[PDB]
Design an enzyme around this catalytic site. Structure first.
Site, PDB file in Angstrom:
ATOM      1  N   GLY A  26       0.737  -1.257   0.000  1.00  0.00           N
ATOM      2  CA  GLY A  26       0.000   0.000   0.000  1.00  0.00           C
ATOM      3  C   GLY A  26       0.766   1.307   0.000  1.00  0.00           C
ATOM      4  O   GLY A  26       1.918   1.364   0.457  1.00  0.00           O
ATOM      5  N   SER A  27       0.112   2.346  -0.539  1.00  0.00           N
ATOM      6  CA  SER A  27       0.579   3.748  -0.443  1.00  0.00           C
ATOM      7  C   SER A  27      -0.553   4.784  -0.623  1.00  0.00           C
ATOM      8  O   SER A  27      -0.912   5.176  -1.747  1.00  0.00           O
ATOM      9  CB  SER A  27       1.764   4.050  -1.370  1.00  0.00           C
ATOM     10  OG  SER A  27       2.381   5.279  -1.003  1.00  0.00           O
ATOM     11  N   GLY A  28      -1.109   5.209   0.514  1.00  0.00           N
ATOM     12  CA  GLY A  28      -2.101   6.279   0.557  1.00  0.00           C
ATOM     13  C   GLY A  28      -1.402   7.594   0.857  1.00  0.00           C
ATOM     14  O   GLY A  28      -0.429   7.634   1.625  1.00  0.00           O
ATOM     15  N   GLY A  29       4.623   7.053   4.400  1.00  0.00           N
ATOM     16  CA  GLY A  29       4.498   6.825   2.950  1.00  0.00           C
ATOM     17  C   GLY A  29       4.361   5.382   2.436  1.00  0.00           C
ATOM     18  O   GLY A  29       3.250   4.918   2.091  1.00  0.00           O
ATOM     19  N   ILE A  30       5.486   4.669   2.384  1.00  0.00           N
ATOM     20  CA  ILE A  30       5.550   3.353   1.731  1.00  0.00           C
ATOM     21  C   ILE A  30       5.381   2.181   2.719  1.00  0.00           C
ATOM     22  O   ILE A  30       5.916   2.205   3.840  1.00  0.00           O
ATOM     23  CB  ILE A  30       6.872   3.210   0.942  1.00  0.00           C
ATOM     24  CG1 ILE A  30       7.466   4.598   0.593  1.00  0.00           C
ATOM     25  CG2 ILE A  30       6.685   2.292  -0.278  1.00  0.00           C
ATOM     26  CD1 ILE A  30       6.659   5.476  -0.401  1.00  0.00           C
ATOM     27  N   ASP A 142     -10.825  12.168  11.694  1.00  0.00           N
ATOM     28  CA  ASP A 142     -10.439  11.937  10.310  1.00  0.00           C
ATOM     29  C   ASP A 142     -10.482  10.469   9.872  1.00  0.00           C
ATOM     30  O   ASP A 142      -9.556   9.976   9.225  1.00  0.00           O
ATOM     31  CB  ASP A 142      -9.066  12.540  10.041  1.00  0.00           C
ATOM     32  CG  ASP A 142      -8.841  12.813   8.582  1.00  0.00           C
ATOM     33  OD1 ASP A 142      -9.762  12.540   7.788  1.00  0.00           O
ATOM     34  OD2 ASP A 142      -7.753  13.298   8.221  1.00  0.00           O
TER      35      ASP A 142
HETATM   36  N1  LIG Z   1      -1.385  -4.358   7.703  1.00  0.00           N
HETATM   37  C1  LIG Z   1      -1.513  -3.546   6.883  1.00  0.00           C
HETATM   38  C2  LIG Z   1      -1.659  -2.498   5.928  1.00  0.00           C
HETATM   39  C3  LIG Z   1      -1.135  -1.218   6.095  1.00  0.00           C
HETATM   40  N2  LIG Z   1      -0.374  -0.762   7.212  1.00  0.00           N
HETATM   41  C4  LIG Z   1       0.084   0.527   7.497  1.00  0.00           C
HETATM   42  O1  LIG Z   1      -0.150   1.467   6.773  1.00  0.00           O
HETATM   43  C5  LIG Z   1       0.867   0.756   8.734  1.00  0.00           C
HETATM   44  C6  LIG Z   1       0.564   1.881   9.507  1.00  0.00           C
HETATM   45  C7  LIG Z   1       1.264   2.138  10.682  1.00  0.00           C
HETATM   46  C8  LIG Z   1       2.269   1.272  11.082  1.00  0.00           C
HETATM   47  C9  LIG Z   1       2.584   0.167  10.312  1.00  0.00           C
HETATM   48  C10 LIG Z   1       1.891  -0.103   9.146  1.00  0.00           C
HETATM   49  F1  LIG Z   1       2.224  -1.195   8.450  1.00  0.00           F
HETATM   50  S1  LIG Z   1      -1.517  -0.339   4.793  1.00  0.00           S
HETATM   51  C11 LIG Z   1      -2.348  -1.443   3.993  1.00  0.00           C
HETATM   52  C12 LIG Z   1      -2.353  -2.626   4.724  1.00  0.00           C
HETATM   53  C13 LIG Z   1      -3.058  -3.880   4.230  1.00  0.00           C
HETATM   54  C14 LIG Z   1      -3.449  -3.768   2.734  1.00  0.00           C
HETATM   55  C15 LIG Z   1      -4.023  -2.378   2.386  1.00  0.00           C
HETATM   56  C16 LIG Z   1      -3.008  -1.250   2.655  1.00  0.00           C
END
Ligand SMILES: N#Cc1c(NC(=O)c2ccccc2F)sc2c1CCCC2
Length: 319
Positions: A26-28, A29-30, A142
């Protein structure tokens, strides 16, 4: 050397050797999925790039770093680990956050036809987490489907800790900036719930102007006592938009969008539609509280400078 480096598309992930077989997710950083040799299970790894590049990034990175460790609930992320490869404060560049691996985003779940059984368990779990944060002095404000994750067995976790860019799920009091209570988060859950039914963003827009327009057409111009709590200038803008009467909730969510094959589902639709209309209320005074939504029959079934920040964060990564 306790670390190694690997490319995941111009992003170099330098991570502890325990974490194996990186793959992006995912990336909504990395963020990466990985196998963690020490725990013999799967983890997600997110890399913050120079999270102290400005006041914005650094304030959030720091706050989320602290809380994520500090807060403890099944419906709220927690860290299994935090590290930086860089050895000194001078060389310090990146922070890596490690969490239990989840399988999907909420965006993905909303695309599905879902039963009431899974939709209500997902909503129940957001309320619990949101409940928990509130009891801790955290009003999120949010919530969106992208900062909410899901496992295959339908367990759900909130990923971040809010404000201290996707704007569709923000409450009227945030869109208008007017001071809020705990039930500012209930608006967002109402937006999410609705999208689950309607499969379209309830209140889209290029900006807050278009956004508020979408809110008033469907829900109608709010009543006078709500206006009386808007500051002079915002109040003026609100009262001066073309006034709409506002569709009822059966019209907003026709039976069509619900399973009607049995009595259970017919009752469940009725209850769902009833909760949507307590959540999707513009005036916080008349919007449902978290504790009450947890009681709803649809739900109750489940009961300072770039230099300075660098150091503050570093200490916390050290800790
Ligand atoms: N587990 C998981 C996961 C994501 N995790 C995170 O963004 C994240 C946020 C804070 C700390 C760690 C972390 F992996 S983002 C994302 C997933 C699962 C598939 C969709 C996109």
């Amino acid at each position: 050397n306790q670390f190694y480096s690997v490319e995941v598309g111009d992003s170099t992930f330098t991570v502890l050797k325990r974490y194996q077989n990186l793959k992006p997710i995912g990336s909504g950083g990395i963020v990466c999925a990985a196998y963690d040799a020490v725990l013999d299970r799967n983890v997600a790894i997110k890399k913050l790039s120079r999270p102290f590049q400005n006041q914005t990034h650094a304030k959030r990175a720091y706050r989320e770093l602290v809380l994520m460790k500090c807060v403890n609930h099944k419906n709220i992320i927690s860290l299994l680990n935090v590290f930086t490869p860089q050895k000194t404060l001078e060389e310090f560049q990146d922070v890596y956050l490690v969490m239990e691996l989840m399988d999907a985003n909420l965006c993905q779940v909303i695309q599905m036809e879902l039963d009431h059984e899974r939709m209500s368990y997902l909503l129940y779990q957001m309320l619990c987490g949101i409940k928990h944060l509130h009891s801790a002095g955290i009003i999120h404000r949010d919530l969106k489907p992208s900062n909410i994750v899901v496992k295959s067995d339908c367990t759900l976790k909130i990923l971040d800790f809010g404000l201290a860019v996707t704007r569709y799920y923000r409450a009227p009091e945030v869109i208008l900036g007017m001071g809020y209570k705990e039930n500012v988060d209930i608006w967002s859950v109402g937006c999410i719930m609705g999208e689950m039914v309607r499969h379209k963003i309830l209140f889209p827009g290029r900006d807050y102007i278009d956004q508020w327009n979408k809110v008033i057409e469907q829900l109608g111009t709010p009543c006078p006592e709500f206006m009386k709590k808007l500051q002079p200038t915002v109040r003026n803008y609100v009262e001066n938009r073309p006034k709409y009467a506002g569709l009822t909730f059966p019209k907003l969510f026709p039976d069509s969008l619900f399973p009607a094959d049995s009595e259970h589902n017919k009752l469940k639709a009725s209850q769902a539609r009833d909760l949507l209309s307590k959540m999707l209320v513009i005036d916080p005074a008349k919007r449902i509280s978290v504790d009450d939504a947890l009681q709803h029959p649809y739900i109750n079934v489940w009961y300072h400078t770039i230099e300075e920040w660098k150091e503050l964060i570093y200490k916390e990564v050290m800790n």
